[PDB]
């Protein structure tokens, strides 16, 4: 049996864990918390860590542990299951990308259609959308969006984007709050994560849902896709089946378990989501490196400068 450190959604992790158990008969305990805590928790424990597998929602968390020489190398077969143009690769082949969640723009189909949207998420910080576009300045995805713009266009365009949003758009406490707002007819559209919406339409019933998602594509900064992955620790005493778990995670069946409950694009190409998701490669997400401490530091300071925090 193994103990998994999970930074992923408990629902998404639960699915993979139980399906894994049916397929093999191996029990997988779960330790759930944010991707950061677990990574540092694993740093403090070191060679004396209970963690057998680290199921992180973010790649940096995997990186810090890879840079700290704590992760066990995965068989090329495993890391190959989800290989594809734009997918994150472990320099030391010591962790593997599993799923991806994208940035989107949900809008009110009662008022707007596609021809009514922008070709760049950047054009939303203009007078054309004064109080017509919403955002969540305190979201971790909103921070990633800053970090990505800076990396794709430069600091100048990032701060300009932020000041324009503050000047025109409208801030919402959480992502779901920005979606309900669009669904109520309080605001035309809003910048959110595709996952929060799929789960809303499935629960209600798409025919009772007025909101719709828009994807910018074109390697736009608005097409930013964040990846999740999994890794095994060198301190594992069940490395035998810890590997098997990460291998399941990347394998078609494991991909099917997650996508049966989660709306995250499968990196394994032989998998069909139960959610209306186009192949991940079709999103045309821009190429970007992992976010660093100083990078978040930088983006957070830009939020202060924009007057959002």
Swiss-Prot record:
A GO BP annotation: iron ion transport
Q: Which GO terms describe its cellular component?
A: outer membrane-bounded periplasmic space
Record carries keyword rRNA processing:
no
Keyword Iron set for record: yes
Can you say where in the cell this protein is located?
Answer: Periplasm
Q: Which Pfam families match?
A: SBP_bac_1 (PF01547)
Q: Which family does it belong to?
A: Belongs to the bacterial solute-binding protein 1 family.
Which purpose does this protein serve, as stated in its record?
A: This protein may be a central component in the iron-acquisition system.
Specify the protein name: Major ferric iron-binding protein
Q: Which organism is it from?
A: Neisseria gonorrhoeae
């Amino acid at each position: 049996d193994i103990t998994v450190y999970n930074g992923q959604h408990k629902e998404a992790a639960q699915a993979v864990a139980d399906a894994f158990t049916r397929a093999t008969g191996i029990k997988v305990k779960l330790n759930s918390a944010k991707g950061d805590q677990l990574a540092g928790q694993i740093k403090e424990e070191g060679s004396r860590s209970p963690a057998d597998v680290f199921y992180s929602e973010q790649i940096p968390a995997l990186a810090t542990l890879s840079a700290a020489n704590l992760l066990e190398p995965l068989p090329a077969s495993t890391i190959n299951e989800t290989r594809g143009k734009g997918v994150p690769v472990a320099a030391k082949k010591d962790w593997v990308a599993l799923s991806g969640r994208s940035r989107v723009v949900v809008y009110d189909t009662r008022k707007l259609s596609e021809k009514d949207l922008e070709k760049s998420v950047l054009n939303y910080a203009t007078p054309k959308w004064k109080n017509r576009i919403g955002y969540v300045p305190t979201s971790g995805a909103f921070l990633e969006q800053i970090v990505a713009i800076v990396k794709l266009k430069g600091e100048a365009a990032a701060l300009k984007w932020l000041k324009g949003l503050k000047e025109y758009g409208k801030p919402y406490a959480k992502n779901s709050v920005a979606l309900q707002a669009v669904e109520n007819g309080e605001i035309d559209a809003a910048l959110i994560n595709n996952y929060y919406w799929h789960a809303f339409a499935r629960e209600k019933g798409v025919q009772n849902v007025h909101t719709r998602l828009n994807f910018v594509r074109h390697r736009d900064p608005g097409a930013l896709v964040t990846y999740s992955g999994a890794a095994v620790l060198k301190s594992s005493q069940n490395k035998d089946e810890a590997k098997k778990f990460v291998a399941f995670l990347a394998g078609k069946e494991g991909q099917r378990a997650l996508t049966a409950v989660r709306a995250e694009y499968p990196l394994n190409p032989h998998v069909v989501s139960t959610f209306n998701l186009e192949p991940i490669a079709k999103l045309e997400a821009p190429q970007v490196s992992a976010t660093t401490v100083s990078e978040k530091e930088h983006a957070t300071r830009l939020l202060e400068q924009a007057g959002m925090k």
